[model samples]
Target: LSEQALNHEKLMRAIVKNLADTPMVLKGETALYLGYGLNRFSEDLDFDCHKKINLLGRVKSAIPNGIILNDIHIKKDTDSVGRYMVRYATKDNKEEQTLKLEISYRDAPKESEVNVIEGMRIAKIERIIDNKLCACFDGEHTRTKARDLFDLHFLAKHYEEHFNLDLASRLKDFSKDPDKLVSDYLVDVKLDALLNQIMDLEETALELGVMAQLIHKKLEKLEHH
Candidate 1:
């Protein structure tokens, strides 16, 4: 891993350790801490809180002084989920090592598990998959994030049964407009382009191919239904 990547991981660990007692449940790619040998690198830390609280204040206090806290911006989406974007420089003080910590309030995970590392609570694999699916759908219409597609492919391949079950439940939640949710999944993906965009030197094109196949299969299932 690169120094920046290592620093990103270290920052995440520090944030988790600092907020161990808070009602913060880590979600998103960073939460994939338990997936053995997963090579994914996350640029932001995602969190979900169950209720209204001073998220910014808590996070500011939790992070150590070694990290240079940069900025905090609050955002609210149509769903009324409050998003706190906290930017900071890594302990090494490398500007390129700066990372964003996104804490979202109101959209709590329906299910989660406590991570053995640092005793941090995280969204379960199922919930993570569902959120990725939603991201793929939502991003398709707005700004397409190749990472979400890659993650869905990764999760589906590694946890096929869990993903399938979770996707069904997630679909039900959007049953009133299921077609909208699955519409983007039916689109074709250019694996070569996506691979070039999302992969680094340590990764390979073959990984993208494998993930593409898994994602295609899931999309096909949703399309046929």
Candidate 2:
């Protein structure tokens, strides 16, 4: 699969280079894998930008020649995030080369929160971890993604002290009832259902179990304060 992985990154690097002039900081699983050396590969490229101005214009112009633009949509709810779906041809030509790009029109990242990866701007470790925490604890999205948890299992440990300072206020943004954000639901979560695309079935289950316990412990401590 390295050939597929290689093509995946090559296409990603092309897009990142094309968007260089824009005020977008890369985030999500792509940033974790490319910017921070996380082992798992993420399919989509996610960016946080100040607004949608000139975003698509640059994206369209970025395609070299053989790439096909499949779909585009603007999300109507909570926060303004736009998505673009594009397919590119790879030499081996066996796998689907579709790449999804998401640009979030949200707060501009602080300079301190940005780091350079392959000469491209990406969210630093703390910002990426905080974003993952929000995704993991989002109460409304009760159907949590095993993918998000997989990424957090490694990164969040380094920020154990940082989250100690950031959690209470951060929880407010994800849910009105912070207690609803507890990790107990993971107990009943089926590994087969969520682990479809990632890892060895047994070992991955154990690691994710540990991740749930860690977050459960943290949430319980937060309730006391």
Candidate 3:
């Protein structure tokens, strides 16, 4: 809803352009041009790549000179655990300079896989002086509403307890009206059952201290439908 970040779209465009030729998959709001409702949530590019991609060099090569790589790190999760990293860069550490780029890659969600939409081999876009391509996946392919709702509910139920007030508030906003956003899109009953299974899995994930309870809480909230 707001465009107050440094080169948010431009950076996302760069990421998209760089990934156009690569063999991978991507989805979520980035693919749909959706934006988080608050904060400097970068419209950074997100992708669902094969779990084994080591495109650090390729990513660096894609960026123009003069910009330095700030840092890159992996984001461990229950689904895409140990299979993804988030990369970011900046021209300089200036407040609101608007010249930052970030790209995140992880394996496709096993429950919500990726696929070409409308028979298009590649989801392509032209922006920020670069022709970008994003491998698109259909959440609907795996029962769209169910997957999305389950994720949201899971986060709210098992994870909200750990979220700070601000983040927890946002998560609540998404969870409060699950049926309108999630259940409405569900075509499979298994989606609800999946929530039960996820909860059981969390018991184990929690014991291991590796499961993201917040995400699960969010998903659990969506299961109301």
Candidate 4:
């Protein structure tokens, strides 16, 4: 993660705190940080807001003063999904930072809860894992993220026990075939790009190898279980 990415995370966390009263149920990587402390280099915030509310207004209110809502794209029609970029400036031009926040109104979160950690509705660990699986298995892994695989390896260590056949059923898109998705990933994963993401390059290769094997094993167990 770059220094700018971490700085953007700090600001996004503040936005999450400010969104405590909204109908947003946090998921995706940003939500993982709030719930599980995965702490990767993610700057995107995704929320599932099923209730009919002024999502854009709520987001604007949640943003603190120093930050500016730089650009926004609202999906027309009844889709109700919106994308926004917020920008902040420190002293120098190089210190300027930007991050993305998104709200989806299509479907309600499968499972979620509001907890004391952030007093915001966050998806359960199993749901997060399922979501990541769907992310990886969707579109034939056309848009699958290398970080999603890394995240699976991390979350499986703790939350793997929480996953059962019922929970795995939530893998609606992935229910078709996970093996092929994982097989394609293992063969052509962005190892060079994923490797350059962090420091400690020597251990990175071993760690990536472990993730590939470990994650596929978990998926196989899920598929056959």
Candidate 5:
């Protein structure tokens, strides 16, 4: 797990460098970590830019390709955080690939957030791995706490409708029970403290009909130790 974390961090740095002078937007778990918030593990690297270039075109150019582009597995919905999953192969003739890339948006702004290093934007060239560059957005003000909370609320609301069953199953496969992880990560760690600081925010979300019901439903499905 430690090795995976190191490699993931290195790969993210490479992504920032590659898009140093471009118009791509990076967010979600990658941005959360880049913002110095947490170092949680995620399924894949996700990026969110407007529908500018063909998704496959940009990916092939960005990452080394011996891989094939799969379909846009999911589409954006009112409560959905990120959209589109691009499946890739590791080899030319082989159908098996260890790595897959997922791209999605969560209220990505118009312009790219650049030079996010040490809480300030500055010009610097980060290192490279696998011939990819490594610069970060210095995302000090990119994502707000409100936005994160709201997004999580939305995800919990539409958990079954938006997520792919296969992908959903993966969550179950890795976890003994899905709700335990969700409650710990989302409710306990992410929002518990916020209840004191932004207690009203939680109320507003509930009042606005952000259904945390489904989330609770999933949580109840877990087998307790």
Candidate 6:
């Protein structure tokens, strides 16, 4: 990410933190702002909520004058959950930086720890890891983000025990085959565009290979029983 993009992201996060009354729990790479193992850069902001609320309206009213919320588009909205796209731009630049925030009104995490970081209610590492694993299998070809795979490898390398328990629980919730999920994750290894985006290519590749082997071993062990 460029210096401008990084600064913009930081500014947006600060603005969101100001909306204290909003009932939503932060997730995704932005949630990792609490200084988790992986220091990945995310383009958009993500959130999970327990009820159907007007996130755009709340955020719009709370945002400062210089920052602009251009438009809000509903990606998906059912009785259970809602996903929205918020296009924003600063007064100096009208280029329109997009921010995605998803709110799961139903079937939300049963357990989550909330930590007040920089006056923001951020989700715990366990929940964040669980979501990242699910994201690995959730989207189609275009939706498959490389950062999700990178985060999994990075987190698994550092928090093996904690990540495995969370991953196992999340895997049980998926109807897809575990082996297939592992295969999908490994497929991104060859994607240069994705791999190159991560900082430290050679070292990251070695670490990811090791993590992949560990995941395969764990999955095979689960299969025996």
Error of 1 at 173 (Å): 17
**Stretches > 4 Å off in candidate 1:** 33-37, 75-79, 94-97, 110-117, 138-143, 165-225
- Greater-lDDT candidate between 2 and 5: 2
Q: Pick the candidate with the highest lDDT.
A: 2
If candidate 4 were superposed on the true structure by all CA atoms, what would the RMSD be? 5.8
- Native-referenced Cα lDDT, model 6: 0.61
Ranking by TM-score: 6, 4, 2, 1, 3, 5
Residue 184 accuracy (lDDT) in model 1? 35
Alpha carbon deviation, residue 92, candidate 2 (Å): 2.8
lDDT of each: 0.58, 0.63, 0.39, 0.59, 0.39, 0.61
Score candidate 2 by TM-score against the native.
0.67
Ten-residue region with minimum lDDT total, candidate 6: 171-180
Q: Which residue runs of candidate 2 sit more than 4 Å off their true CA positions?
A: 64-79, 94-96, 157-164, 167-225
Clash statistics: count for each candidate: 0, 0, 29, 0, 8, 0
Candidate 5 residue-wise lDDT at 160: 38
Q: Each model's TM-score? A: 0.64, 0.67, 0.36, 0.68, 0.35, 0.69
- Looking at model 1, residue 155 earns an lDDT score of 62
Candidate 5 — worst ten consecutive residues by lDDT sum?
126-135
Between candidates 1 and 6, the TM-score winner: 6
Give candidate 3's root-mean-square deviation (CA, Å).
16.2
Give model 5's clash tally. 8
RMSD of 1: 7.6
Query: Could you give candidate 5's per-residue lDDT for residues 156-223 as a string of tens digits?
Result: 33333433333233323323333433343444334444233433443534432324343334555754
lDDT of 6 by residue, 57-172 (tens): 77676666567777889898887777777777886777877777666776554334665667776677777876776666543433455566567656767766554544744433
